[PDB]
Each structure stands twice: as C-alpha cells, then as structure tokens.
Design a protein around this nucleic acid. Structure first.
Ligand SMILES: [Mg+2]
Ligand SMILES: [Mg+2]
Ligand SMILES: [Mg+2]
Ligand SMILES: [Mg+2]
Ligand SMILES: [Mg+2]
Ligand SMILES: [Mg+2]
Ligand SMILES: [Mg+2]
Ligand SMILES: [Mg+2]
Ligand SMILES: [Mg+2]
Ligand SMILES: [Mg+2]
Ligand SMILES: [Mg+2]
Ligand SMILES: [Mg+2]
Ligand SMILES: [Mg+2]
Ligand SMILES: [Mg+2]
Ligand SMILES: [Mg+2]
Ligand SMILES: [Mg+2]
Ligand SMILES: [Mg+2]
Ligand SMILES: [Mg+2]
Ligand SMILES: [Mg+2]
Ligand SMILES: [Mg+2]
Ligand SMILES: [Mg+2]
Ligand SMILES: [Mg+2]
Ligand SMILES: [Mg+2]
Ligand SMILES: [Mg+2]
Ligand SMILES: [Mg+2]
Ligand SMILES: [Mg+2]
Ligand SMILES: [Mg+2]
Ligand SMILES: [Mg+2]
Ligand SMILES: [Mg+2]
Ligand SMILES: [Mg+2]
Ligand SMILES: [Mg+2]
Ligand SMILES: [Mg+2]
Ligand SMILES: [Mg+2]
Ligand SMILES: [Mg+2]
Ligand SMILES: [Mg+2]
Ligand SMILES: [Mg+2]
Ligand SMILES: [Mg+2]
Ligand SMILES: [Mg+2]
Lengths: 167, 98, 260, 143, 188
RNA sequence: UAUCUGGUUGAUCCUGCCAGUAGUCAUAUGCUUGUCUCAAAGAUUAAGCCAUGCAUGUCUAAGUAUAAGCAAUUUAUACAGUGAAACUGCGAAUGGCUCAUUAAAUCAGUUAUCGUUUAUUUGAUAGUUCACAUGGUAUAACUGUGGUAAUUCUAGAGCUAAUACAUGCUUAAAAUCUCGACCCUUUGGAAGAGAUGUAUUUAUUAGAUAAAAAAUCAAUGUCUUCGGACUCUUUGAUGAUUCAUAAUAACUUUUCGAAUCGCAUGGCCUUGUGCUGGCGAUGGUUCAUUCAAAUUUCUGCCCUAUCAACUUUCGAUGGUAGGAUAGUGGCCUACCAUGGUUUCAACGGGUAACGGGGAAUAAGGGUUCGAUUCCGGAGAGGGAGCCUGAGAAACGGCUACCA
RNA sequence: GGACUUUUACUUUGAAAAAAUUAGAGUGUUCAAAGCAGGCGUAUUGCUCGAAUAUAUUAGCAUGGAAUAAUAGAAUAGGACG
RNA sequence: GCCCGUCGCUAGUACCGAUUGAAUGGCUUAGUGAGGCCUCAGGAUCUGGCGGA
C-alpha cells in the first residue's frame, strides 16, 4: 500500500522526511515532520494499482465512464464567484442566482441554499461609513486637545514673564 | 502539593528511667488523681517545664521590658483564667514555683 | 523554566491576602494588569473572603458574568483581575462603592465610600517623559498613561483622575510636609506627612515620615505615596487612619470595650 | 597606557558619530566628546585634553557606571589597558568567634586618562560586561 | 547549534567546568552571512519572538552618504579593497561592517553639477543665482576630487548586512581617508 | 532544660575507653492491637525495565455550515434555529514526577540593564496608502474509485467556505522645503511642478544652562524709521549618556495604516437603493503597564596535600575589528600582545552532593541531617540536533546515532 | 549648583525584608494535636472583634558614636596656608 | 609467681603476588562519520518580456 509521490525518479521505495503541504503526509502537530516510506514515480511490476486520468477520448465509449457523468456536489458560494460561474454582470443581484438545493424529509420539500459571502449589503456599508467617520473624528479631537495644551504653556509663560516683571 | 497539617507531641520523659524515689511519687500521684497511665503525669510535667522556661527566660529581661510585660501579664492572666496560680501571685515571680 | 508560570500554590500567595491554609492546595493566581502581582488583590478574594458575598469560586464567576461589578469604570469580569491599591470597586447591585486601601497591619481592608467619592481616584506618578511626536505623558502606580499633563507635573507626585474620562484635574507634589501613605515593607499603612528626603544619588532615596502621633519612621521613596496636606487628605481614610498602635495599646483597648 | 601611538590599529580609531569637517577652518582638528559619569567623579582633565580613543573609557567612551562602586589595591599592571586589584576583607567564623584574612582579585578596565602603578589604592565602578572577566572600570585614584 | 554561553570557556583561574544544563535555544548563535557583491538575494530569519532579521547575500547596490555635504545617494558597490579584521575578506570581496569599498561615484557628481556645478575634476537665469550663492563652498579636497577621475569613490560600510539586509555606508574623507590611503599604498 | 552509673587492684587514687542511659519528621523488623481525630507512604538499592487503561484539549450574539444533519417553525427564495465532521484561532513551554548529573556550579541574601527579548492583561496611539456599491484562486470536511497483514497510513478524481491563504482604493486643512516658465538688472521676486503618514537602514543635526560681554570671515532669518538695529525670546529626565524626543539627505524584493463579525435599526430632503447614524467583538502598528525571561554585582560551599603548582593541543588573560545573538561578553573569527589563579590553598581528587525555607538533639557554645508538601535549579533510557512558537534545545513534539 | 574630600576594622539604630516552620498573643477545636476561626441581637431580612507581635544574626544598604585596633601625612622640604 | 620468642593445630582479616590480570564509570587524542540546520546548485510542475514558488 505505499503511495508514490511525484518528482522522485525512482522505481523503488525510499524513506523521506515530509512537512506540511507535501504529498502522502498529513501532519498531526505544529511544525511536525515525520519520516515515512514512499514508492517511486516510475511504474514497475511491483505496483498493485496504477492511477490514471483520461486526457483524450478514444474510439469506443468505455464501460461506465464516457457514458456516465456525475455532478459537482457544490456550487459557487462567493458573490463574485457566482457572477463568474454564470458570466454575470456586476449588477445582476446574484442572491436570485444562488442555486437552491430542493430536498425533502417526507412532504417537507424544502429548499436550502448557502450563505453567500463577501456580498455588498447595507450593514457592510454602514460599517464602512462608521469607521471612515470615526477616524477623522478622533483625528481632530486630538488636534484640539493638542492646542489646548499648547495654550496651557502659552499662558504659563504668563508667569514666566510676570514673575520676571514682578520681582 | 497541599499545606502540611502541623503536629506536635505533649509528653516528655525522665532521663533516668529507674529512679525509685520519683517512681513511687509518680505512682501515688496517679493513684490519687485517678490517672490511668503515668504518661498523663509526664505530660503535665512537660507543659510545666515549658511554661517555666518561658517565664524564667523573661525573668532575666530588663525589668519592665515591653514584650516581657505583654507576655508576662498574658501568661499570668491565662493561668488565673484556669485557676491554678493564686490571685495573690499575679506578678509572675511565683510562676517559677507552680 | 520554559515559559510563563500560570499557577499559584498556596503558601506562595501574599500573606496580606488572608487565605486559610487548608482550603485545598492552590491559591488563585492574579492576572496581568494594572498592579504588580505581589502588590494586588483579585476579585475572587474580594467577593469571597473579604465580603463573604460568594460561597464558592464557582459562584464568583456567576456573579461577575452579569456585569454587576465594575472597577475604576468598566465591568472587568476577569475573576483573577489584579485589583490594586486605590482602585474603585463599584457595584450596580446594593449601590455599594469601595476604595482599595490598606490597614496598618499591611492588608487590604473593606472600605465603603460615597457614590460621589467613587467618581475619582489618585495615582503616584512613576514616570514622565516625552513620546509620540513630542507629546509628553505620565504613567503612575495605576498602570495608565495620560497625555498632555501640566509642565509642573514631575515624578513621584500624586494626581487626581476623573475616571469618566482620562485627564487629571489636580496634582499634589512630593514636597516637605504633604500627607503620605506608606505602601511597602510592613511600615505599610502608617501615615505622616513628610519629614525629609535623603537623596543618596545612585538609588533608593529614603523618606522620613512622622505620623500625627509624634512617632517617627523611615521607608524607601518608591514606598511613600503623597496624598495631600497635613490633616487634609484627598480620599476617605480607613478606621484607625494608619497610626501604628502598639501590641499593648491595641490589646489594652481591646479589653477596654469589655461589657456587652 | 597606549604609549604615544594614536592610529596603531588595522582599523581607524574614531569616536562614533563625532564628525570633524574638512571643509571648515578649525583650531581643534577633532570635535571631541566627553561627559561626567556623575556620583562626584571629576572627569580628569587628561581625558578631555587627551589624544587617545577608548571605547570602554567611562568619560570619553560609550559605557555607563551603574551598580556597586568599590575600592581596592592594584596588584597587576601587566596587561594592556587593564589591571588586577586585590580587595581584602576579614571573614567571621562564628564557632571560633574570630576572623581570618581572605582576599579576592577582581579585574577592571583602566582608561588611558589615568596612569597607575602597583600598590596604589583606587576606586572603580561596576559597568556593563566589557570582557570575559572585567566587570568594573577605574574612576578615581586615591593614592 | 552554536552556543554563546560560558559553561565551556573554563574559568579565569584555569579550572575546567563540568557540563550542566545542556544547551537551550536562548543561548543560540547562527552562521555568518558572508555577504558578497551583486545579484541582491536576501533571506528572512526568525529571531527571538518574531523580529525577523534580514540576512543579506550577494548585494550589489547600497545607500552611501557624503557626510561633508549632508547628502545620501544610492550607488552600485564596485568592490572591496581593505578590511581590518581579515585580509581574506577583501580577497573574497565579502561585505561586512567596517569594510572599505569603492562605489560608482557618478550619482555623487551628477548631484554636484546639478548643485554648484563647477566642473569638478580636470545656463539658466534661475540656476546661476544659486550657483553664485553656493560658490566658495565648492573646493573640497586634494584627495577626494582625484577619485572622480577614477570614477570610483572610497567609502566605508556602516551597516550590518548580515543583520539589517541593507548595506549602507559613508564616503571617506579627512584623516580617515589619509589613514586608509597610507594603508593601501604602503601595503601594495 | 547545667546529674550521671557498671568494668583495670588484695585494697587505693588517677588516665582512659568500653558498656550502661535518654531523645530522633529515623528507617527497618519482631510480638501485641479496642475507639476519636490527624494521615506520610517504591527516596535510599536500580535517573533499572515496564503489559494495560487513563493523565490535553478547547466555541461565544459575535471568523467559517448547502451535513444529500436533527428540528420545523416562521416575515425571511441569498444566509438566519440546532449542529457532527473539517478549517481557522488559542493551548498543549503551566501542571504533575524524580534528584541522576551538578563543589565557585546551583542556591541564598544583596545588586545591574545607561546591556536585552517579552504572547498575554491593562492604559494610551494612526485623515497621509493614487472595482470602494468591496478585487484572487486553491483546499479540508463531503462525494467517489483505490491500495496495504498491519497504525491517529493514505493515493488518484470531482466540488465549496474565511478574521486561512494572496492582495489592493481611500480623507480636510495647514505649513516647510526643493526645483522654477516668465521679468530686470535690483535691496533682488514670481505664477505653479513635485515633495513631505508610520515602520526599516545609513550619514548629519538639535537636544541648551558653571556667573557675565564684544569683534570679525562665510553664508543668512523677521521688522525698515534703508544710518540700520536685530529687539523679551525656548526648553524634558537621570547621579550619569550619543537618553527621551526632534529635524535634514537618502535607502527598503517595503511593517503597519480594518476588504472582518453580532445585536439592534433610525433619522434626514433636493426621495438619489442618496447621504447618514447606536451599542460592542475580533483584529491592528508604536509606546506604556503587568505576567515574564535572559543574562548580572557583592559575599557565603562538605572532605582531601598519599593533589603544588595550575591555565593556552584546539582561547588560556587582554586589546582592535568584525561576525553571531534578543542583546553585553573570547560567545566566535582575524590580527596583535603575553597575560590569568594560587599556602589568604589555586589546580586536581572524593562526595553512599541538587541548593535553600528548614529537621533532630533542649545550660550555653555546639553536633548532626534535609531525596521528600514552599522557593529555585536539572531531567525525562543515554547523547546530539531541530520544527512550531510569544515562550521549548520540549521529549505524554519530531530527526539521527547507542542501548 | 559649584569647587574637594587619606584609607579601614568595631558598635548603635533603621530600612529591605515570602509563606509554612519556630517563639508567641487572642479565640474555650466538647479536651487535645490542631484550625483561624469567631463572638454578639431584634436569631423578621443584623450587629460586631480578628486574622498580632517576634525572628535574618554572615554580606550589601542607610544612620549615630570616635574608646579599642590598624593605614596615610612635613626630613635632601618636591611641605602648609595667601 | 610472673613471663618471652621460634616451632605445631583450627578459624578469620588484611597485605605482597606471574597472569603487561579482569570489571564499572568520567573525560580525551587519532580515524570513520549519521542527522537536522545554514549555504552553492537542481528544476517533477505551476504559474507569476523577465522574475516568483
Ligand atoms: Mg464576510
Ligand atoms: Mg488566573
Ligand atoms: Mg552629536
Ligand atoms: Mg598584554
Ligand atoms: Mg574484671
Ligand atoms: Mg578485682
Ligand atoms: Mg591477697
Ligand atoms: Mg554508648
Ligand atoms: Mg517520594
Ligand atoms: Mg528510584
Ligand atoms: Mg442550517
Ligand atoms: Mg428559512
Ligand atoms: Mg513544570
Ligand atoms: Mg541562574
Ligand atoms: Mg494557486
Ligand atoms: Mg534639557
Ligand atoms: Mg551633540
Ligand atoms: Mg536615539
Ligand atoms: Mg433607511
Ligand atoms: Mg589517594
Ligand atoms: Mg611544597
Ligand atoms: Mg575582543
Ligand atoms: Mg604564555
Ligand atoms: Mg588545605
Ligand atoms: Mg547524587
Ligand atoms: Mg560530639
Ligand atoms: Mg531539598
Ligand atoms: Mg545537603
Ligand atoms: Mg539519592
Ligand atoms: Mg520543585
Ligand atoms: Mg527540560
Ligand atoms: Mg526509567
Ligand atoms: Mg556519554
Ligand atoms: Mg528532549
Ligand atoms: Mg510519560
Ligand atoms: Mg511535559
Ligand atoms: Mg590480555
Ligand atoms: Mg553558512
């Protein structure tokens, strides 16, 4: 059962140390790398199963692949992704275009759909408005609070000169 | 990992173990007050000697030394509080003789 | 020892906390915050030992999660919050308000205060220096920084804070003859308004304090906390007002109130 | 020390960020930098007038004096720009209720501003570790 | 890896010290960058508590400043001709602090002639005014004016390329230049 | 709580050891054993070896739900309740256990950072970035086809999420510098062209103050009463700085500067899907605080000379420069020098040695013990190495060698 | 703030000072070893005292003392004040 | 009377002793040298004219 791993140029089995993002390795801790066995990328009579993908159809329809077709389990869930899955314009109100999933529980023929994400909605713009406003508000709240201090010393020089012109 | 539950023992023992004079006295005292083991006597001798070196220690302190007075009147107070030291003997020079 | 210690065994907890010895095996580790660990007191202790409000520690959290408690302002629901000296513990329920002040023995005592007095608090300035784009700031015992303070506000001086906002209103100074409060060693709790300071360049300037009983004593600078003018404090002091009653004095008057 | 040789290293000696300008006319030829450590230690005039360059010097160099301030008798002037002093003391042995002569030889940096000999009493202040053994720097010579 | 501790490095008295508390990460030490010229290639390094440090290898251009003129321009580092720590560093033309290098020098003259522009070496109404109010501050040195003909100027590195990632410096002048001049000639 | 007694002689007084005697938070063992409370306990020998099970996981209104999930209710045909799995985040560096190594080490009291790192908590802090009605795929869980005796093994194939991953707009004024198209020759000045957030790197400058004043060379700032004068002018902290902070010319594979989420939803007309606007959550630079860490000053260890000289082979002591570090430092390298400890016991050896708070023994002075409930240190069969991270040279993490 | 100070030992007082331990106060755990509780009314909706003190002693810090015991000072005057 | 030494029996302890004797731990020369880390290259693919992984 040892799986092969692309880019090894070997018809035999070897042992390497793998990390995150690498083939035939699912880490179990942070920064965890464990040494495991791997079969080479060159096919050999020792292989028990070969895995392959069609890239060009032949002359006769195959037993159950060229005939059969199965659908993609899920559909677009990000607003711009539905837009580009239906080649939609940027103003077509995708919430009407999000494909539903008709299902039942008896005569409970309900229709569920995904919470489309990254959508531009009132609350979203309310938040953007609020932030972009709060920034400038404090921006000059502190400028005024700075001038008030400037004046504290501007008129502390009052006594730096009145105790000089009074003694 | 948990606080140590303090302990201590309440009975001393005479160094000489076969002094017939002290043994006979000890026995009559036990048989008089209704004691069961002679160690209930050894015990009383223990607390006595403790109180005695606690007092005798202060007795060499400069008369009227602050802690001497505080703990002195405290000691005599609790002794009369139990009723062993007479009320006339409330200046602690008689505590060495209980 | 590989990192941060997040436990606190018993017998390691501050003594002024008044924790019984056999109550299991650990004390509550105060959290990180405004006051130093060994120089603070947590809410679990306050609401459980000092005020006997909660029976278990499990109940203390149930109490806090309702926003009943607030300190110096906001709710502060951290069961292990390091509430320190001079902090103000208000209480939505019961209308009670408290200020954290020591005894003469050295522990934190329960001291109720007016709703009026609960609006302010003081702080011994521990550092003052310029900062971001030339604006000077002040940091004090509290663990809070106030921007744009008065150019006369130096270090070691006390300050009054609004607590509705941040800015300070008055700032007492560390000058000969000003009400002080000892917070350090076990002279901590004594009060008496200044005798004089020994600079001792290089470190540890010493303060001479005379209680208003004609009794002298000394402590180190970072332990003294000016509070105002002789006889005129700036906060409500606790019973006994820190004057170091002797053991014989307190026992004598302990037996004074003799008959019920 | 440094024995009348100003530029004797493979690298050019200079004080960091102390810029002399060749365009301008000048009667100093070296903008010098100096300070007073404090605690009542007069910056020796030989430090300000001096030609030397010492990074570890408490007055002309980039080092601060903080911590203990001790005194001792110089025992070894053999190493360059450093000395070993013998600080004596007497240890109390409680059982016998008497003392015993002990000693310790601490090494301390010596700036070229001071000129020392062996047998002279001297005061040194603790500074940042500047070597494997030296932890103090000479600040004033009593002898 | 490396350990900058003192458990080893036996005591000043000469005694040998036994191994206690085997090596920990805080007493760590890493390998040198040994930065060389050209094809700027830098790599990040995770120092204590984040705080990335930029180990620079193969660096070709740096920011060099003319101190007597209060200016800073970036030029291409041409080579290394002297290093007080190791002659081998100059032989390999490695880049480390205090290294004496040679720089393009054309920017530092393009600015001069955009500046007073008094044909150092060997017409706008508004430009002549400043040129005139700048003159008498144009003669610089019988030792730095010469290097422009060579088209390479002697500078000294002041940064830590193996730490900062940048390799900056300042042009040499006055007695510092006099020192390195006698060094270079009297040596070769 | 300041005590002695039996044993050398035919008898005697001595010296003197033996034996007697009392206690031990001192172990074992023997015999005996009814009650209350209290309740240590595989340290010693073997830091020797271990079957099995358990000892680290974790969700709030508030990152991610199209479970082909339960529940059906309920304004909800984008999402809306409840929620496995999985991602994301955080934690797993605390705890607990043991005393092997360790003798100027650890530890203790006392110091230092003007000698550094610091998740978090707490307090402050950002108008400046040149599709905004909001920009990009590439993936788990899932589906499905598989391999292997065998494990928390995983492969090929097909989808889809974000506070994951990768990006990329924005905002007033103001002032100061640079160039300067023209015009006119004088004392010279102008339309307008850019530049200027923070963070990194470098060079320069300010950062005064020990009591008072002038002349002049080079530039050159406000006010002209066109000889001229230049006018009171500002200053933070420490004992102590090149400090805090600031300015100038540039540098950067360019840090940060909210594309995030919950509960409510309202004003306000010139009715634009216009402009607005409440509470509080996650984040985010820089400073501060707190929890820390790392080094660090002074002084103090048991026996040993049948250990007197020791330290540089292959750093030993110092200097310079650099490199490396979070940062000081022979920490490391290069060059140079010849230093450094010692009868006031170095150096070496031993230890049935972790250090300390402390325990036992009660005239006092002492003697003896501390593996062990608290503090500190060290380790996880022996070594070394390292990933993640704020923090580990971690071991209920990984890698290698030995057993 | 400036200008300058012969060095020590000893003794006093004080600060700094973890808890438990220990010495020790209070409190009647039914006694006691212990524990830091507890004690009071209107026991109907509260009143109230506590959680001491001592102890570190070698070294470092701070302060008073000037006996005891050292060190240095003016002799080729290269002395002291001005 | 006391008393000394060789000689002889039993038992025990330690010493000297061919075996260049044996064993256990701590270092360490010389030689060989795993592994991870840093670095010069590499380029299964995988995507951004000339760079990245
Ligand atoms: Mg979203
Ligand atoms: Mg806590
Ligand atoms: Mg300067
Ligand atoms: Mg030398
Ligand atoms: Mg006989
Ligand atoms: Mg006889
Ligand atoms: Mg006879
Ligand atoms: Mg005996
Ligand atoms: Mg045990
Ligand atoms: Mg064992
Ligand atoms: Mg659902
Ligand atoms: Mg619905
Ligand atoms: Mg632990
Ligand atoms: Mg240490
Ligand atoms: Mg991709
Ligand atoms: Mg200043
Ligand atoms: Mg300056
Ligand atoms: Mg600075
Ligand atoms: Mg509306
Ligand atoms: Mg021997
Ligand atoms: Mg000899
Ligand atoms: Mg060096
Ligand atoms: Mg030699
Ligand atoms: Mg000896
Ligand atoms: Mg051992
Ligand atoms: Mg004896
Ligand atoms: Mg121990
Ligand atoms: Mg021991
Ligand atoms: Mg042992
Ligand atoms: Mg421990
Ligand atoms: Mg470990
Ligand atoms: Mg084992
Ligand atoms: Mg080994
Ligand atoms: Mg390990
Ligand atoms: Mg385990
Ligand atoms: Mg563990
Ligand atoms: Mg053999
Ligand atoms: Mg390398």
């Amino acid at each position: 059962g040892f799986p092969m791993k692309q880019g090894v140029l070997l018809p035999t089995r070897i042992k390497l140390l793998l990390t995150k993002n690498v083939s035939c390795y699912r880490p179990r801790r942070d920064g965890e790398r464990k040494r495991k066995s791997v079969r080479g990328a060159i096919v050999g009579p020792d292989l028990a199963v070969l895995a392959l993908v069609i890239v060009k159809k032949g002359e006769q329809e195959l037993e159950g692949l060229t005939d059969t077709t199965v659908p993609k389990r899920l559909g677009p869930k990000r607003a711009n992704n539905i837009r580009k899955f239906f080649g939609l314009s940027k103003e077509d109100d995708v919430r009407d275009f999000v494909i539903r999933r008709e299902v039942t529980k008896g005569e409970k023929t309900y229709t569920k759909a995904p919470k489309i994400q990254r959508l531009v909605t009132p609350q979203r713009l309310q938040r953007k408005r609020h932030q972009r406003a709060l920034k400038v508000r404090n921006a000059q709240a502190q400028r005024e609070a700075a001038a008030e201090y400037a004046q504290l010393l501007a008129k502390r020089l009052s006594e730096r000169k009145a105790e000089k012109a009074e003694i | 990992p948990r606080a140590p539950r303090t302990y201590s023992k309440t009975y001393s023992t005479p160094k000489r173990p076969y002094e017939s004079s002290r043994l006979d006295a000890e026995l009559k005292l036990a048989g008089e007050f209704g004691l069961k083991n002679k160690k209930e006597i050894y015990r009383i001798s223990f607390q006595l000697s403790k109180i005695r070196r606690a007092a005798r220690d202060l007795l060499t302190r400069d008369e009227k030394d602050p802690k001497r007075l505080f703990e002195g009147n405290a000691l005599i107070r609790r002794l009369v509080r139990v009723g062993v030291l007479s009320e006339d003997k409330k200046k602690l020079d008689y505590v060495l003789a209980l | 020892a590989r990192g941060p210690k997040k436990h606190l065994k018993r017998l390691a907890a501050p003594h002024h906390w008044l924790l019984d010895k056999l109550s299991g095996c650990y004390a509550p580790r105060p959290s990180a915050g405004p006051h130093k660990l060994r120089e603070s007191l947590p809410l679990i202790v306050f609401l459980r030992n000092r005020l006997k409000y909660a029976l278990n520690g499990r109940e203390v959290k149930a109490i806090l999660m309702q926003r009943h408690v607030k300190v110096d302002g906001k709710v502060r629901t951290d069961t292990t919050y390091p509430a320190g000296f001079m902090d103000v513990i208000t209480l939505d329920a019961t209308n009670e308000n408290f200020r954290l002040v020591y005894d003469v023995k050295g522990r934190f005592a329960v001291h109720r205060i007016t709703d009026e007095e609960a609006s302010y608090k003081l702080g011994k300035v521990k550092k003052v220096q310029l900062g971001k784009k030339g604006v000077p700031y002040v940091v004090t015992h509290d663990g809070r920084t106030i921007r744009y303070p008065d150019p006369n506000i130096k270090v070691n001086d006390t300050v009054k804070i609004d607590l509705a906002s941040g800015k300070i209103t008055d700032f007492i100074k560390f000058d000969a003859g000003k009400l002080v409060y000892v917070t350090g060693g076990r002279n901590l709790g004594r009060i008496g308004t200044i005798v004089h300071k020994e600079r001792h360049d290089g470190g540890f300037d010493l303060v001479h304090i005379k209680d208003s009983l004609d009794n002298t004593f000394v402590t180190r600078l970072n332990n003294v906390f000016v509070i105002g003018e002789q006889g005129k404090p700036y906060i409500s002091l606790p019973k006994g007002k820190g004057i170091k009653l002797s053991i014989a004095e307190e026992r004598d008057r302990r037996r004074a109130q003799q008959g019920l | 020390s440094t024995e009348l040789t100003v530029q004797s290293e493979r690298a050019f000696q200079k004080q960091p960020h102390i810029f002399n300008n060749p365009k301008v006319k000048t009667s100093k030829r070296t903008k010098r930098w100096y300070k007073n450590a404090g605690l009542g230690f007069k910056t020796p005039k030989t430090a300000i007038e001096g030609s030397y360059i010492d990074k570890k010097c408490p007055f002309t160099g980039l080092v601060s004096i903080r911590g203990k301030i001790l005194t001792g008798t110089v025992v070894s002037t053999k190493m360059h720009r450093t000395i070993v002093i013998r600080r004596a003391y007497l240890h109390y042995i409680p059982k016998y209720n008497r003392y015993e002569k002990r000693h310790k030889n601490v090494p301390v940096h010596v700036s070229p501003a001071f000129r020392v000999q062996v047998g002279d009493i001297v005061t040194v202040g603790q500074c940042r570790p500047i070597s494997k053994t030296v932890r103090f720097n000479v600040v004033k010579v009593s002898a | 890896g490396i350990s900058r501790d003192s458990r080893h490095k036996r005591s000043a008295t000469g005694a040998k010290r036994a191994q206690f508390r085997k090596k920990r990460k805080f007493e760590l030490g890493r390998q040198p960058a040994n930065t060389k010229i050209g094809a700027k290639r830098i790599h990040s390094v995770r120092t204590r508590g984040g705080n990335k440090k930029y180990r620079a290898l193969r660096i070709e251009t740096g920011n060099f400043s003319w101190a007597s003129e209060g200016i800073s321009k970036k030029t291409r580092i041409a080579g290394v001709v002297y290093h007080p720590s190791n002659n081998e560093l100059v032989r390999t033309n490695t880049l480390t602090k205090a290294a004496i290098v040679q720089i393009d020098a054309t920017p530092f003259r393009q600015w001069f002639e955009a500046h007073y522009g008094q044909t150092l070496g060997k017409k706008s109404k508004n430009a002549e005014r400043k040129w005139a109010a700048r003159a008498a501050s144009a003669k610089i040195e019988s030792s730095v004016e010469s290097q422009f003909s060579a088209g390479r100027l002697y500078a000294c590195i002041s940064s830590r390329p193996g730490q900062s990632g940048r390799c900056d410096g300042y042009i040499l002048e006055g007695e510092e230049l006099a020192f390195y001049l006698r060094r270079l000639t009297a040596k070769k």
